Amino acid sequence: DENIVVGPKPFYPIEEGSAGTQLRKYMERYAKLGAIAFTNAVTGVDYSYAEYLEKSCCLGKALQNYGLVVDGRIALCSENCEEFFIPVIAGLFIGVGVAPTNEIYTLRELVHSLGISKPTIVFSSKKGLDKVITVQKTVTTIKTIVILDSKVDYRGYQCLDTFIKRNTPPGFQASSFKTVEVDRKEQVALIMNSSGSTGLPKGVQLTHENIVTRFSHARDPIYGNQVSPGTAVLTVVPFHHGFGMFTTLGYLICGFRVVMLTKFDEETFLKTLQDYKCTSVILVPTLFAILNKSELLNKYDLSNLVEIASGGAPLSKEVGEAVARRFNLPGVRQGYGLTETTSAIIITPEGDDKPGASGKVVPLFKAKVIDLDTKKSLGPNRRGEVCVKGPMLMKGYVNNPEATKELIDEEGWLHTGDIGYYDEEKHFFIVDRLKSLIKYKGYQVPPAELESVLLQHPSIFDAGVAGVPDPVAGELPGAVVVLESGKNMTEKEVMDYVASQVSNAKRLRGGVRFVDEVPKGLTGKIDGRAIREILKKPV
Ligand SMILES: Nc1ncnc2c1ncn2[C@@H]1O[C@H](COS(=O)(=O)NC(=O)c2csc(-c3nc4ccc(O)cc4s3)n2)[C@@H](O)[C@H]1O
Ligand SMILES: [Cl-]
Ligand SMILES: [Cl-]
């Protein structure tokens, strides 16, 4: 079947050893070099590779001394902090599965998530502690809570350093610690949760094989960023999520200084780029809005920035092109993936550009686009459901065989739930989620196409589009809009503006509501249910 698109061979073959073994090898190299691994952009606190490696080894030993066995479970519950990856790496080193969560989860989300992954120990931020204590009342198998981002014991709980000290012999040498080899294709490494699900979070099981595949991509000269220890990268994405998890772990294999930024005011954003000489960043779409509007770019030395990427959610082609132009860059790089594919499986290849494209199939992967009804493969320039296959496919959901069966078909293809197409040169374009398409008469209108038009308006800061029920037409496209400060548009002004830019079918017949915040998930995807609820309310 010539409709299947097959990715190339990676420049760097997948290395032998577990994901823990590989991380240890590279971290040790950068440790001896004296490089910095993590920097908190706002405080300027650094962890060297040497310190991060030492603590990760010491925590690995501590978890073994505590009694955790291969295929045990720990969790994190934390907003981004520079300590976040210590329990992750320790788990990978010893073959204990790690379930990351964020403090920003609701209690309903967190109780469900941790109830599925069943961690023995939770590494909680100070901020997340109250939620973890509450969850423990239901998930009563959580034995121990350790405070991740405190140097001292906190509210009666051991901090990370205390837990390590209490579970390792005095004078324990990290250099002596051995990574634990595992059955790479079978051994769960991480239990992850997607963002923007319409239901409660499922536990996505990712293996060591999944992760070491990512390590090849991450440092690939075409599909990643080349090893360059000391080079700084800015990161803004949530660490608990696959997007932040596998970009960050990849950056550690690359030897980069991971500059973690948690505040997105333009001054701090720009000052961070300048002060740490950041050479690249992967943004989410809302951060592009800040950069397109900024009147301050000229005040900062931004000359070190040679790459801007995007992922997680649809990016307006025109907004991306404007921002790339401001920075005098050829274009915005992009990656597209799902929690269930570990990381990005379509990435813009260096040297092989195409306006508006999401990129090309990554090494070791295959992709196809199927007809929504027949499920048969399609040629180029035909919209259908993107499906993918390759060694980053998850092992399956935790204790949910039905959901696994629905996602990964009898022929081993993962059905992404996304609409897209590929062109004659095999560039893929991801349009939107199938579930988001607005059923206006016989049309299937992608909200992202309307959102792009809205975002391009200089008075519109943010927008989200969804379908308003309608007896005659099925669904009418409607929009929720956040206006830029000091600007005003009426509903009619927005509707007329959109009508001037789109087909008749795409008009905002469902109307426009103005809000302070567009409802979205943790990595920028529009919350359709929430938008529909807002549109339902009378003005
Ligand atoms: N680039 C994109 N364009 C449009 N939509 C995109 C998208 N990426 C994810 N999505 C949407 O998120 C859904 C998946 O949501 S999810 O489960 O929460 N997981 C993800 O969103 C997810 C998991 S890993 C990951 C990426 N890793 C990267 C590494 C480098 C890089 O440059 C870019 C990326 S994006 N994204 C997709 O089905 C799709 O609807
Ligand atoms: Cl999201
Ligand atoms: Cl979310």
DSSP letters along 118-151, please?
A: --SEEEE-TTTHHHHHHHHHHSTT--EEEETT-S
Buried b (16+ CB within 10 A) or exposed e, 513-537: bbeeebbbbbbbbbbbebbbebbee
Identify which of 192, 210, 236, 521 has the alpha carbon closest to the alpha carbon of residue 339: 192
Which residue from 282, 336, 345, 347 has its CB within 8 A of the most atoms of ligand 1, so it is best to mutate? 336
Identify which of 39, 191, 215, 180 has the alpha carbon closest to the alpha carbon of residue 119: 191
Which H helix or E strand runs over 415?
strand 414-422
Least distant ligand from the CA of 250: 1
| Beta carbons within 10 angstroms of residue 350's beta carbon | 15
Could you say which DSSP state residue 168 is in? S
Structure tokens at 203: 């536990």
Which residue from 282, 338, 369, 452 has its CB within 8 A of the most atoms of ligand 1, so it is best to mutate? 338
Which H helix or E strand runs over 209?
helix 208-218
How many A from CA of 521 to the centre of ligand 2?
A: 3
In ligand 1, the atom with minimum distance to the C-alpha of 348 is 32
Q: Could you give the CA distance from residue 104 to residue 80 in angstroms, rounded to a whole number?
A: 10
> Which residue's alpha carbon is at the smallest distance from atom 32 of ligand 1?
335
Residue written as token pair 């590494």:
123
Q: Could you give the CA distance from residue 464 to residue 478 in angstroms, rounded to a whole number?
A: 9
Identify which of 225, 222, 192, 190 has the alpha carbon closest to the alpha carbon of residue 105: 192
Residue written as token pair 């956040």:
482
- The type of residue at 65 is N
Domains of the chain: 1-9+355-433 (2.30.38.10), 14-48+208-351 (3.40.50.980), 49-207 (3.40.50.980), 434-539 (3.30.300.30)
How many A from CA of 312 to the centre of ligand 2?
A: 7
In three state form, how does the secondary structure of 444-473 look?
CECHHHHHHHHHCCCCEEEEEEEEEEECCC
Least distant ligand from the CA of 339: 1
Which residue from 109, 202, 243 has its CB within 8 A of the most atoms of ligand 1, so it is best to mutate? 243
Which residues contact ligand 1 via a Cβ below 6 A?
Answer: 194-196, 242-243, 247, 282, 309, 311-314, 334-339, 343-344, 358, 416-418, 430, 433, 523, 525
In ligand 1, the atom with minimum distance to the C-alpha of 334 is 32
Q: Could you give the CA distance from residue 456 to residue 312 in angstroms, rounded to a whole number?
A: 19
Show contacts of 107-114: CB within 8 Å, 24+ apart. 107/131, 107/134, 107/135, 108/200, 109/200, 109/201, 110/77, 110/135, 111/135, 111/138, 111/139, 112/200, 112/201, 113/193, 113/200, 113/201, 113/203, 114/75, 114/77, 114/139, 114/142
Cα separation values, 144 from 119, 122, 174, Å: 9, 6, 24
How many A from CA of 298 to the centre of ligand 2?
A: 32
Show contacts of 161-164: CB within 8 Å, 24+ apart. 163/59, 163/62, 164/55, 164/58, 164/59, 164/62
Show contacts of 168-177: CB within 8 Å, 24+ apart. 168/58, 168/61, 168/62, 168/65, 172/58, 172/61, 174/53, 174/54, 174/57, 174/58, 175/57, 177/57, 177/58, 177/60, 177/61, 177/93
How many A from CA of 196 to the centre of ligand 3?
A: 4
Least distant ligand from the CA of 523: 2
Could you say which DSSP state residue 68 is in? -
- 281 - beta bridge partners? 234, 308
In ligand 1, the atom with minimum distance to the C-alpha of 196 is 18
Identify which of 160, 337, 328, 308 has the alpha carbon closest to the alpha carbon of residue 246: 337
> Which residue's alpha carbon is at the smallest distance from atom 33 of ligand 1?
335
Could you say which DSSP state residue 505 is in? G
SS3 502: coil
In ligand 1, the atom with minimum distance to the C-alpha of 417 is 38
Cα dihedral 133→138→142→148 (10° resolution): -30
Q: CB of 510 within 8 A of CB of 502?
A: no
Structure tokens at 372: 């929504």
- The type of residue at 485 is S
Structure tokens at 347: 């990435």
Identify which of 335, 367, 365 has the alpha carbon closest to the alpha carbon of residue 350: 335
Experimental method: X-ray
How many A from CA of 176 to the centre of ligand 2?
A: 42
- The type of residue at 431 is V
Q: CB of 202 within 8 A of CB of 240?
A: no
Q: Could you give the CA distance from residue 533 to residue 344 in angstroms, rounded to a whole number?
A: 32
Cα dihedral 132→138→144→147 (10° resolution): 0
- Resolution of the solved structure (Å): 1.3
Q: CB of 305 within 8 A of CB of 278?
A: yes
Cα separation values, 420 from 42, 266, 435, 496, Å: 38, 33, 13, 28
Least distant ligand from the CA of 201: 3
CA atoms within 13 A on the CB side of 424: 0
Q: Could you give the CA distance from residue 445 to residue 437 in angstroms, rounded to a whole number?
A: 5
Backbone angle region of 171, left / alpha / beta, with phi > 0 → left and psi within -120 to 50 → alpha: left
Question: Which residues belong to the active site?
Answer: 214, 241, 339, 439, 525
- The type of residue at 89 is I
Pairing mode, strands 344-347 and 333-337: antiparallel
DSSP-based helix, strand, coil % in the chain, nearest 5: 30, 25, 45
Q: Could you give the CA distance from residue 463 to residue 316 in angstroms, rounded to a whole number?
A: 12
How many A from CA of 345 to the centre of ligand 1?
A: 9
Structure tokens at 427: 């560039």
Q: Could you give the CA distance from residue 392 to residue 339 in angstroms, rounded to a whole number?
A: 10
